[PDB]
Amino acid sequence: SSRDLLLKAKENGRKSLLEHEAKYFISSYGIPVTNIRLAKSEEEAVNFSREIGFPVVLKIVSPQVNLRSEEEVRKAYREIIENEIEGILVQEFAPPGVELIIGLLRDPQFGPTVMFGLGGVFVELFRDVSFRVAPLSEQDAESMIKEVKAYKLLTGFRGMEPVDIEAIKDALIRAGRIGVENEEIAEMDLNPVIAYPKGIKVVDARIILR
Amino acid sequence: SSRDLLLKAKENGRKSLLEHEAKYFISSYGIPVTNIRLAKSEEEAVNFSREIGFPVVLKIVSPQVVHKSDVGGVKVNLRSEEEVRKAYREIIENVKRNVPNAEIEGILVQEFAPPGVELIIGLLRDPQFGPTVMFGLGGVFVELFRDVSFRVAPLSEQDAESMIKEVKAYKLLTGFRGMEPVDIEAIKDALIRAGRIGVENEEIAEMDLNPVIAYPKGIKVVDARIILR
Amino acid sequence: DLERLFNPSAIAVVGASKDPSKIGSQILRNLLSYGFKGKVYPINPTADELMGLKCYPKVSDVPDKVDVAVISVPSDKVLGVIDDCGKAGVKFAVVITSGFKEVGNEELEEELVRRAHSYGMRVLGPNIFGYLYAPARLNATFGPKDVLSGNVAFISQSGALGIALMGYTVVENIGISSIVSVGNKADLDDVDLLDFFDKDPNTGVIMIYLEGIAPGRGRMFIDVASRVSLRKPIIVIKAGRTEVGARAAASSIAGSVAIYESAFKQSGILMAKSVEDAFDWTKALSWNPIPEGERLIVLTNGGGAGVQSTDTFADNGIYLSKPPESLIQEIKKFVPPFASFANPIDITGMAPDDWYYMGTLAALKNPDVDALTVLYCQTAVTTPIGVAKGIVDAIKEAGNSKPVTVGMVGGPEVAEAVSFLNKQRIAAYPTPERASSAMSALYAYARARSYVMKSLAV
Amino acid sequence: DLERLFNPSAIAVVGASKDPSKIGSQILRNLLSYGFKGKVYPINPTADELMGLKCYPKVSDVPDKVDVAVISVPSDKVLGVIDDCGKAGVKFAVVITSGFKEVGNEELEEELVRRAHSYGMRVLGPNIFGYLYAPARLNATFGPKDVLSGNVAFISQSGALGIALMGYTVVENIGISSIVSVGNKADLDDVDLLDFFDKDPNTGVIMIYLEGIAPGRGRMFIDVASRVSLRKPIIVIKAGRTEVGARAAASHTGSIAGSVAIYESAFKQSGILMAKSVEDAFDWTKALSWNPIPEGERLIVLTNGGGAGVQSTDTFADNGIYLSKPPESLIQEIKKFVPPFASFANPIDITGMAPDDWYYMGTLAALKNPDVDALTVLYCQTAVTTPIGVAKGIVDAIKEAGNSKPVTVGMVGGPEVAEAVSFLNKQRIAAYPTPERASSAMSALYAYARARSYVMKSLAV
Numbered sequence A: 001s002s003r004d005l006l007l008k009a010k011e012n013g014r015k016s017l018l019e020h021e022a023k024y025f026i027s028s029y030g031i032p033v034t035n036i037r038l039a040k041s042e043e044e045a046v047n048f049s050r051e052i053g054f055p056v057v058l059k060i061v062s063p064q065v066n067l068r069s070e071e072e073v074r075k076a077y078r079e080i081i082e083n084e085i086e087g088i089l090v091q092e093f094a095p096p097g098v099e100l101i102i103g104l105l106r107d108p109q110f111g112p113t114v115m116f117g118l119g120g121v122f123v124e125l126f127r128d129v130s131f132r133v134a135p136l137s138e139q140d141a142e143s144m145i146k147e148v149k150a151y152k153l154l155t156g157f158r159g160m161e162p163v164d165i166e167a168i169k170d171a172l173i174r175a176g177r178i179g180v181e182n183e184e185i186a187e188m189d190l191n192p193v194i195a196y197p198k199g200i201k202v203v204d205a206r207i208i209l210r
Numbered sequence B: 001s002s003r004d005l006l007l008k009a010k011e012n013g014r015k016s017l018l019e020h021e022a023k024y025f026i027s028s029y030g031i032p033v034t035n036i037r038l039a040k041s042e043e044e045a046v047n048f049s050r051e052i053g054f055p056v057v058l059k060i061v062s063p064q065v066v067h068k069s070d071v072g073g074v075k076v077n078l079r080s081e082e083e084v085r086k087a088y089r090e091i092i093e094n095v096k097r098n099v100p101n102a103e104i105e106g107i108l109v110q111e112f113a114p115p116g117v118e119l120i121i122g123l124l125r126d127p128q129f130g131p132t133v134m135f136g137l138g139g140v141f142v143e144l145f146r147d148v149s150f151r152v153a154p155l156s157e158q159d160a161e162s163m164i165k166e167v168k169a170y171k172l173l174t175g176f177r178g179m180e181p182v183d184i185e186a187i188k189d190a191l192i193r194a195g196r197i198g199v200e201n202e203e204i205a206e207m208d209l210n211p212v213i214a215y216p217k218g219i220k221v222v223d224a225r226i227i228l229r
Numbered sequence C: 001d002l003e004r005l006f007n008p009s010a011i012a013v014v015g016a017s018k019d020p021s022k023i024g025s026q027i028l029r030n031l032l033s034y035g036f037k038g039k040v041y042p043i044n045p046t047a048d049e050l051m052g053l054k055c056y057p058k059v060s061d062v063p064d065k066v067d068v069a070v071i072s073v074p075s076d077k078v079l080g081v082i083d084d085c086g087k088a089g090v091k092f093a094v095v096i097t098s099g100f101k102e103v104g105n106e107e108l109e110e111e112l113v114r115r116a117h118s119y120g121m122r123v124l125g126p127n128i129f130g131y132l133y134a135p136a137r138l139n140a141t142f143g144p145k146d147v148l149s150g151n152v153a154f155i156s157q158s159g160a161l162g163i164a165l166m167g168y169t170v171v172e173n174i175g176i177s178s179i180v181s182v183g184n185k186a187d188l189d190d191v192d193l194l195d196f197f198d199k200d201p202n203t204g205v206i207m208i209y210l211e212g213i214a215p216g217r218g219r220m221f222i223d224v225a226s227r228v229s230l231r232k233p234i235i236v237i238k239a240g241r242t243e244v245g246a247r248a249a250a251s252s253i254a255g256s257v258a259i260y261e262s263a264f265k266q267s268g269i270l271m272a273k274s275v276e277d278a279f280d281w282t283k284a285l286s287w288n289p290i291p292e293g294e295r296l297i298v299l300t301n302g303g304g305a306g307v308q309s310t311d312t313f314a315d316n317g318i319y320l321s322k323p324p325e326s327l328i329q330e331i332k333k334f335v336p337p338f339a340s341f342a343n344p345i346d347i348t349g350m351a352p353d354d355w356y357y358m359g360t361l362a363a364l365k366n367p368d369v370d371a372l373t374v375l376y377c378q379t380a381v382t383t384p385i386g387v388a389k390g391i392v393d394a395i396k397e398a399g400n401s402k403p404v405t406v407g408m409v410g411g412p413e414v415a416e417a418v419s420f421l422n423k424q425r426i427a428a429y430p431t432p433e434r435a436s437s438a439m440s441a442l443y444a445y446a447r448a449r450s451y452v453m454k455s456l457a458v
Numbered sequence D: 001d002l003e004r005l006f007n008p009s010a011i012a013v014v015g016a017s018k019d020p021s022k023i024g025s026q027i028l029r030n031l032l033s034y035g036f037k038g039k040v041y042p043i044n045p046t047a048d049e050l051m052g053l054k055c056y057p058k059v060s061d062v063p064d065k066v067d068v069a070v071i072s073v074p075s076d077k078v079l080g081v082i083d084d085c086g087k088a089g090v091k092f093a094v095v096i097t098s099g100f101k102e103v104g105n106e107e108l109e110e111e112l113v114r115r116a117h118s119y120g121m122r123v124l125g126p127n128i129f130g131y132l133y134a135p136a137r138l139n140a141t142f143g144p145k146d147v148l149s150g151n152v153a154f155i156s157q158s159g160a161l162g163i164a165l166m167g168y169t170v171v172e173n174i175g176i177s178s179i180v181s182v183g184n185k186a187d188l189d190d191v192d193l194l195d196f197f198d199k200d201p202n203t204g205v206i207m208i209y210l211e212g213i214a215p216g217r218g219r220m221f222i223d224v225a226s227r228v229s230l231r232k233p234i235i236v237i238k239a240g241r242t243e244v245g246a247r248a249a250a251s252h253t254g255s256i257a258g259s260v261a262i263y264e265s266a267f268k269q270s271g272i273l274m275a276k277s278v279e280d281a282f283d284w285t286k287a288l289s290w291n292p293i294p295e296g297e298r299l300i301v302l303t304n305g306g307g308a309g310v311q312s313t314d315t316f317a318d319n320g321i322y323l324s325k326p327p328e329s330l331i332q333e334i335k336k337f338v339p340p341f342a343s344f345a346n347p348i349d350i351t352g353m354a355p356d357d358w359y360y361m362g363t364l365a366a367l368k369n370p371d372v373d374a375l376t377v378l379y380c381q382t383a384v385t386t387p388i389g390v391a392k393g394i395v396d397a398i399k400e401a402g403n404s405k406p407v408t409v410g411m412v413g414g415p416e417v418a419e420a421v422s423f424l425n426k427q428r429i430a431a432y433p434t435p436e437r438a439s440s441a442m443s444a445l446y447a448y449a450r451a452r453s454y455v456m457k458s459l460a461v
């Protein structure tokens, strides 16, 4: 079970899932993610990087970029080490698109609640956000999407085609389900999420435990 | 007088000022613009390039041209005297055989504009209230969300300040991720002068300052459009 | 199950006295004057009789199964009375008495509830002004002695404003099925009451003054409110609907404004920002069916009111469309050539009284008309009461039930006419904006209903 | 200069008749019943006398200098009457008669104006229900015969709604200095009228129902309205303040839809308060009419219950008005009689146990306190009080306070509260049947203070 990830984290006295564990957990609920592998050795990092295809990104994995070949990656591995580790994350490249935030929080009154908004300044600065209490219906997901002021950024504008609204609705509904079913999850942040004319991809995921 | 530009355009039956003329006119009212020069010769294009500093952009200047890029009359990122001599002749040739019967006024040498926060400053004529100034943030914020404010000219300092703070995308001027606060005073100053242009020049039907770039210090109009009546 | 709370066979009043200024005494008085048909048992240590009724020293001494005990004794005596009521098998304890959680005595309040539950007894309040149920001729409050009879159930978390609004319903001609003060909500709350009013055939509309919901109660609130919304409109006046006000009402923790709003939307609930809006909407929803479609007609003897109406409807996402050609033909039988038919239909200020009858009738009968707002501006060529009578006659002869609101502008004669119409249970208001806002509420509810239906789809 | 329009020595009524159903006849009756002390000259071809007044066949025949001619003849006769009025030296032609630009006869209307001006004559209307000026006891309308006297000048571009609202001022206890129907605005308009009311000592507040202003008139409108705003609040009810409504209102006049956003900006630059509804307009007018502007932001709210106080807080917040802690001196005073579980966070909650006398003491203490700039008093009817008793307490407190600080009152309850609110409003104390309306009224006072400050800063040297 994917719940083994949560149990393992709890057993290790951790308050959060590591980056790769979070993506695995999100993936098992049917939410698409950028492909990743956890490298425990240089031989594994090279092995995995070549496996999923270039270019890849490397970042540290510990409770405490733009690589194209094994030759280039061998440098980055040691560079990252130099610049108490669980390992190094090898991440697939994410083509640019329209950025989204899908959140999950727990309200004292209403319990698990889903948050939606567009990325960059629109959430971070303008706080242009919508909320729906989980579990989410299709009607809940659609309406909360149409509700935000920056909605029009999803329906086509200068130099950007319309994105897959259905894919977004689908992810929102599944985010709600994660919150309803997993009591030990206090908070979840899918940010950034990239919307394309077809499908979406969670690039970064944060899950907090309680 | 800068009004000579308007009179000249009118006498030749033109309904708009050329790109460089619009900037000269805007500059004479004390509104900052990205630096430019009109080159009448290759040697002047080179001298002006050194004057304005690299990299520079070159464009054809002619009333008949409306889309310089399409006609092959825009050379970008010229960094050396040699590159400028090349671009100069490339443009003369390209336009001279893509719009053969063309009356060229010269070639425009334009300064590079460091990136920043984009603004829109407009001037229109409302049937009731006459010359009115429009303000908004650039990109999607005006084009898509239509987030704009209006003030009837002449503008006071209080008019300019309040109309700036009024727009929904105001926070983009006061500092956000990866961007320092910009010169609000410079923006107010430009808005007030835009209003003055509208009040004093009856023959100006419409003016569009777009894009305008705000920096932590000062602003710079990159492109200016002036329509006559 | 609150059947025995609203329809009890026997009610005890604890705290009544020879002193008519005591809260219990006021409650007892209201109970008798309002005509409660069950048994009333005043409870008092000494008095052998109060208001002609045999008095007892303790509820346990009452030779009868008491359903409801209305407790108005001092807080330091409440628990003692609870034990007695429990021993006596009382099912509901209505604790009028204040001085619990709202003054920082959380321990006393929790003890009150647990001790109540140990006997299988439910608690209303504490810190409340009581409750009223018209179908059972039950006025167990120390508020006004009377209310107009109707289908509106009003639940209030606030005391002073609640008891004042109780009186205000009379002035605004709102027919009441029930008034319930819930105060501290230590036990029985909005969820429980909504569950009862859902099943109540006497209640058609539910108005709630809500400060906040108890932690962990929100999901159930949405589940219950949604199903209720399918058949009965719910209007909520939210206390602390702004960030600043939310903190003020917290004097446990400031609840999320944005999440409360979303919760209301998912429940199909209409949020009113003011008492006036809440009452104006309640009136219309109480006296009209929901529009079965979007073809709304506005009728006016002047463009001015019609424009105010258009703007007001527009602010509510309601846009008027061209009237059916058949309706235009009907009206053209009597209206001048310089009349507008763009909707609003402007029959001009020259319109005499009878034109309001003919116009209203034509509109209501027309099969392609779903709702009607009738606007009137007083002029010397008309009488307000004549116009009102014409509208009444038109509605009756129409022989159908389509939503109607009325806006009348003018002097004292208009005030009288509006009052006449409202006493006919025809939603009438002294301005075009309020008439159109009221009609907007009807459409808001129709759309809210649709939201909930779609959200519950299989 | 409209001095002779509002204060004429002689008024002619053209179109009056023995038939009491005629418009001119209705106007003549109102003129006499309202008590005009100048001379009135009925004009009619045959009648030798109307309502006991010597009648003449033409204005030119009047042996007297006529200042104002009220014309209610058919449109095809109006021009003939204008020529006669010109010959007679009439300064103002008040053209009741409809059937001009609003029905597509722009040519007739322009000719009316042109021919008027050739005689040095100004035109009001056409297509209007007349005008009223209380200080001159002049009711030249066919509306209600009477209005309450006061300092509010009401200008209306609408006919039916205008004449109806005229009556509504009575029900809402609004004291009127003037009613002016401007209708088609062929000549005299809002600008001209604002100029007069600026100089009028009888007018303190100006309410305008405005559909639109003429092309090229906007700049002057802002110039005049801003300066007026420096001393007197202007409330505008804008017809067609939405995109959708603007188009509709362009048909009723025969014009093109002006820009909503630019009208809003113009109003801001003029210091004008825009009301979205008749109710808001009247509620604000009442408060502005009976109160001076707050000298500062230290607003106190008083209530016998947290519920009303929260509604008040929310409503004030929606208007960008935020309450702050009361002065300690005021808290001490109130603590002399208030229970221990009372809140002093502002709103000051004297609890539902508050008897009548506490409203007197609290109100008095607040108004007297030098660090209090304004007071909103909220009351919820309880068995412990009488609404009229509370109202009288507030009245006594305001009197004994011996100052003029802004006060609004919100009372909630049954018929007794309805009576109490009416009592207060007849005392020219702004009282409302809900806490939200009381607080919106108080908000209007602060809105005007801020608008006026805007204009001042805008005019800085």
Ligand code: NA
Pocket: B004, B005, B006, B008, B009, B017, B018, B021
């Ligand atoms: Na020129």
Ligand code: NA
Pocket: D049, D050, D051, D052
């Ligand atoms: Na007579």
